[PDB]
Design an enzyme around this catalytic site. Structure first.
Site, PDB file in Angstrom:
ATOM      1  N   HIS B 228      90.604 -24.871 -56.389  1.00 17.82           N
ATOM      2  CA  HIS B 228      91.532 -24.053 -57.167  1.00 17.82           C
ATOM      3  C   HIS B 228      91.411 -24.352 -58.656  1.00 17.82           C
ATOM      4  O   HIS B 228      91.349 -23.435 -59.483  1.00 17.82           O
ATOM      5  CB  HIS B 228      92.964 -24.296 -56.680  1.00 17.82           C
ATOM      6  CG  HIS B 228      93.983 -23.387 -57.295  1.00 17.82           C
ATOM      7  ND1 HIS B 228      94.503 -22.295 -56.633  1.00 17.82           N
ATOM      8  CD2 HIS B 228      94.587 -23.413 -58.508  1.00 17.82           C
ATOM      9  CE1 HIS B 228      95.379 -21.685 -57.412  1.00 17.82           C
ATOM     10  NE2 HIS B 228      95.448 -22.343 -58.556  1.00 17.82           N
ATOM     11  N   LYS B 235      86.573 -19.194 -64.259  1.00 17.34           N
ATOM     12  CA  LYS B 235      86.896 -17.826 -64.655  1.00 17.34           C
ATOM     13  C   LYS B 235      87.178 -17.735 -66.151  1.00 17.34           C
ATOM     14  O   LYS B 235      86.728 -16.794 -66.816  1.00 17.34           O
ATOM     15  CB  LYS B 235      88.089 -17.308 -63.850  1.00 17.34           C
ATOM     16  CG  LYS B 235      87.752 -16.945 -62.411  1.00 17.34           C
ATOM     17  CD  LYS B 235      88.912 -16.234 -61.725  1.00 17.34           C
ATOM     18  CE  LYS B 235      90.146 -17.120 -61.646  1.00 17.34           C
ATOM     19  NZ  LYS B 235      91.261 -16.450 -60.918  1.00 17.34           N
TER      20      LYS B 235
END
Ligand SMILES: COC(=O)c1cccc2c1-c1ccccc1[C@]2(O)C(F)(F)F
Ligand SMILES: COC(=O)c1cccc2c1-c1ccccc1[C@]2(O)C(F)(F)F
Lengths: 343, 343
Positions: B228, B235
């Site tokens: 995560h 990103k």
């Protein structure tokens, strides 16, 4: 005497933070020793009294120690020296001449304050212990005390250096080549590192001028402040690099990057000196935890913060450490960060 | 009802932080569904009630909003579900079977809490404004609320996954290859980046195992948590890299370094996506300032902090940004960081 009366009066005023552009415009062609004297004979007592009132708010367990008392007597005497110029007339050239000599005496009087407060911190650890509550109180006070001292010395240095067409405006270089300051601090640290270790890593500098790829990176700043920060960072990065490679032959170089953005001027110093665990990095900026029977990092950060910048450390245990100096790229954003006595 | 009575009782207890080694030793060969049930039917109400009592201490301006009320009703119902297993006998296999199904229902009930609190933060900004005092209050509560939620979900995931000789102990990998998790998060971010930008930077991984230069870097950790954090960081690093080079042809790669020290396991992600000024970096971890009519970084840091780690950002405006995940190298140091309701 009337030292408490002066402190109580001027502590009601707040210090007036000046920007780097103000310092540059005040000290250039329009510089007037009369105007600077009129401002300083009021602003210096205000800044002195504000920190002196915070010193009085310290617990008597610290206020009655010889270190705090010795420093407090320096500030009382320095405050009284400035008091004698209030009723004086600025139109007398002898009045301005005596004021400059008084500032030099005050500057040299407070010249030995870093080892004195270092002695005071060690006295506190051996008297009441090193609990985390005491560290936060000591850190909070010393940061504000030293930052206040930097701001007072800045005002005094600007007056005495200018009133004695140069390119430097007192201690300010309006065209400070950052890479040249990096090299100077590196060369000084290399001389010390070769004398003690008979080995020193090399220097690699890379500039990134985002707006003008070709132009060398210049800024308006105080070169001595930037030198101090880079010199302390170079000494740590060389000590770690040489010691972590004593059993090896290759000596990794110290890589410095200078980035000029639209708002920030950032200086990253990368070493491969084995790194430091995160638990101990957060203690490197603590006066209490960096005192032994060692203030390069905490004071260097205060210099960075003095003009709205910062100095940060992030290490990789088992490899190396990055040190980043953040500075404001524009003189209009380089405003004094001053502690103010509040309630 | 008696929901306030349960909250008041169990909030007097403090949550019991468990280490990663405890989770591993509890869930391995000596795992007993009876023992886990006996512990969880007491520890889950304690952790639920502690955060529920902090929610009640919120001002009625926030407590009476539909978002907080909806979430508070989820916790009341979840608390009441666990209450029915106190008098039940652990020696009945149907008692343990119903307890596991009850945990799954509770986990899915709280599954949509991140967009709900995002709606609540936006409601607060549009109702009372975004003053810095409100940001610190919202940041302080949301950090503790989400960290509490992570710890509860961790306990539930360990019970439901193990009680249903594998190499994984629930959600924990005792031999988690860090580089493999980095690649997985990179590959997922690359697929999204190619679909939206028709271009993606490459990946470069370098490992530094200080104690064993040859050995690949393994650790005991929860791979989904590490995924995560790396996925959110990839990103951001890809979005900045591609957008800051739209008018250029060369696309700088994303460089990831994995360092294994004696105490820290550090993961640095370096991009050249133009960087961010320091003023805005400190706002990237704020829920209030990252809400628009965007919580990847604040939640990712909570995952890192959950086992005594951290996640830090340091950028160079005009060049790029480094992101560092700090993790504990030893399972004995990976203890739950739990918020406790104090006075
Ligand atoms: C026209 O403005 C001034 O001349 C002036 C006005 C106020 C304060 C100062 C000056 C000045 C000039 C040279 C050195 C130092 C200074 C100051 O004392 C300060 F900037 F350091 F505060
Ligand atoms: C011998 O010890 C145990 O079996 C045990 C004891 C207390 C708590 C748990 C266990 C256990 C075992 C497998 C999964 C989850 C758990 C726990 O509920 C916790 F670790 F998640 F808290």
């Amino acid at each position: 005497g009337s030292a408490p009366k002066y402190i109580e009066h001027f502590s009601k005023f707040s210090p007036s933070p000046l920007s780097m552009k103000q310092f540059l415009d005040f000290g250039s062609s329009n510089a007037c020793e009369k105007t600077s004297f009129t401002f300083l004979r009021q602003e210096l007592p205000v800044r002195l009294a504000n920190i002196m009132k915070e010193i009085n708010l310290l617990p008597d367990r610290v206020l009655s120690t010889p270190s705090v008392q010795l420093v407090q007597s320096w500030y009382v005497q320095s405050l009284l020296d400035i008091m004698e110029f209030l009723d004086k007339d600025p139109e007398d050239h002898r009045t301005l001449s005596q004021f400059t000599d008084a500032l030099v005496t005050i500057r040299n009087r407070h010249n030995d304050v870093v080892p004195t407060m270092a002695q005071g911190v060690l006295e506190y650890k051996d008297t009441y212990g090193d609990d985390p509550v005491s560290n936060q109180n000591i850190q909070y006070f010393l940061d504000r005390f030293y930052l206040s001292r930097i701001s007072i010395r800045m005002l005094i240095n600007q007056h005495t250096l200018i009133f004695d067409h140069p390119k430097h405006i007192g201690s300010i270089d309006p065209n400070c080549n950052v890479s040249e300051v990096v090299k100077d601090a590196y060369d000084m640290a290399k001389l010390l590192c070769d004398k003690y270790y008979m080995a020193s890593p090399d220097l690699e500098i890379q500039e990134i001028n985002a707006a003008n790829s070709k132009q060398p990176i210049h800024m308006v700043y105080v070169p001595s402040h930037l030198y101090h920060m880079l010199f302390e960072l170079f000494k740590n990065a060389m000590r770690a690099t040489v010691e972590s490679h004593e059993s090896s032959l290759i000596l990794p170089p110290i890589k410095v990057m200078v980035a000029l953005g639209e708002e920030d001027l950032s200086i990253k110093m990368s070493d491969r000196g084995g790194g430091v665990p995160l638990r101990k990095i957060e203690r490197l900026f603590s006066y209490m935890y960096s005192t032994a029977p060692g203030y390069g990092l905490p004071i260097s950060r205060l210099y960075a913060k003095y003009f709205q910048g910062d100095l940060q450390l992030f290490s990789m245990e088992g490899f190396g450490t990055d040190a980043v100096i953040y500075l404001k790229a524009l003189s209009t954003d380089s405003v004094e960060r001053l502690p103010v006595y509040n309630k």
